[PDB]
Design a protein around this ligand. Structure first.
Ligand SMILES: NC1=N[C@@]2(c3cc(NC(=O)c4ccc(Br)cn4)ccc3F)OCC[C@H]2CS1
Length: 374
């Protein structure tokens, strides 16, 4: 019921995302559902795709209502297609409630499900504006807040076989150390934020800060990498290269086109910290989040032809995406009631004896509004 009963309600595997158990229909059908703050549709497998463990069978549900409307969602790395309806939805290890939510019954997809994963649909937690087919399709969390007395916020602790917590309706103070710092949500569509400054190992990148948000910056648990606009990526790598001079590496590595390996002997110490300064709550005030190489150098456990690592910072043409690389350092509070997102040092982030992930402030930063793109 309460927040204790929600601790540790997330599961997954490295590179396959975090999922929460949900029930849909009556009687309740159990599905595992990818937690995605980067989209706004609740969409589940509804047909026996050979790689799904379980799927939504509408014919078995007494409370199912056909909306007599289809939906077609292409995106860069894939597509799904489905039939809109509504049904009763519960979260067993969430608040003690049942709600009537929109469901897209997925009937055809390409490169949407992961071969080998233990989830079979997606929970988009972002805002109606980016819901398919349009913002009249009320996102799940909107329905949850409207139909109940669950407070309008949730928080995510992503750890990594991975685990974590999704606290629906509140904050659990044991999941973080130090204090929460809040950045405003710039516009309620994605969880858009504004980055005001970037440092590699204390050294500023000294770019026009608008480049950091071209054409936007988002917090997205449905993306693995920290993704950076192309110009920003170029400068960051050039600067990460300079700082990690001790060893040299091929161009293909930085591009995520090869891995690089060490004996059972990783010198994380040879790699720099990365700091993002975010717009703060108050005029001219910012704060910074700092991640370790333990967040951006990801063990590739599946290398059959060989301890290898993927460089998990990549180029974007869609703006900055603070994906799992960022969120695994932090307890992240999606404070929808106050249009703000909070960051605190996660009690489960992977670090060593030399260095920690950090959230520090306040700092004084001028023209922070100028960093947003229009
Ligand atoms: N936010 C995102 N949403 C998606 C989307 C995301 C995912 N995510 C993952 O598989 C995933 C997450 C975390 C880790 Br760690 C590893 N993998 C799977 C299918 C999707 F369709 O939906 C609409 C846009 C699309 C791309 S961007």
């Amino acid at each position: 019921g309460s927040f204790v009963e929600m601790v540790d309600n997330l599961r997954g595997k490295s590179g396959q995302g975090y999922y929460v158990e949900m029930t849909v229909g009556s009687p309740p059908q159990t599905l595992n559902i990818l937690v995605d703050t980067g989209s706004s549709n609740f969409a589940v497998g509804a047909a026996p795709h050979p790689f799904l463990h379980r799927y939504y069978q509408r014919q078995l549900s007494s409370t199912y209502r056909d909306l007599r409307k289809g939906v077609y969602v292409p995106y860069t790395q894939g597509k799904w297609e489905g039939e809109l309806g509504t049904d009763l939805v519960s979260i067993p290890h969430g608040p003690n409630v049942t709600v009537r939510a929109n469901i897209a019954a997925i009937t055809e997809s390409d490169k949407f499900f992961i071969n080998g994963s233990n989830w079979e649909g997606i929970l988009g937690l972002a805002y109606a504006e980016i819901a398919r087919p349009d913002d009249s399709l009320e996102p799940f969390f909107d329905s949850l807040v409207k139909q109940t007395h669950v407070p309008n916020l949730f928080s995510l602790q992503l750890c990594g076989s991975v685990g974590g917590s999704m606290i629906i309706g509140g904050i659990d103070h044991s999941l973080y150390t130090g204090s929460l710092w809040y950045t405003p949500i710039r516009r309620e569509w994605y969880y858009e934020v504004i980055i005001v400054r970037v440092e590699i190992n204390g050294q500023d990148l000294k770019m026009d800060c608008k480049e950091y948000n071209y054409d936007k910056s988002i917090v997205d648990s449905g993306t693995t990498n920290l993704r950076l606009p192309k110009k920003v990526f170029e400068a960051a790598v050039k600067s990460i290269k300079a700082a990690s001079s001790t060893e040299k590496f091929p161009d293909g590595f930085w591009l995520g086109e090869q891995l690089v390996c060490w004996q059972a002997t990783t010198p994380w110490n040879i790699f720099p910290v990365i700091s993002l300064y975010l717009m703060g709550e108050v005029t001219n005030q910012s704060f910074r989040i700092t991640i370790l190489p333990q967040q951006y150098l990801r063990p590739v456990e599946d290398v059959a032809t060989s301890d290898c690592y993927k460089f998990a910072i990549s180029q974007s043409s869609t703006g900055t995406v603070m994906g799992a690389v960022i969120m695994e350092g932090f307890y992240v509070v999606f404070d929808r009631a106050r249009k703000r997102i909070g960051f605190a040092v996660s009690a489960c982030h992977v670090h060593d004896e030399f260095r920690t992930a950090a959230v520090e402030g306040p700092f004084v930063t001028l023209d922070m509004e100028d960093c947003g793109y229009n």
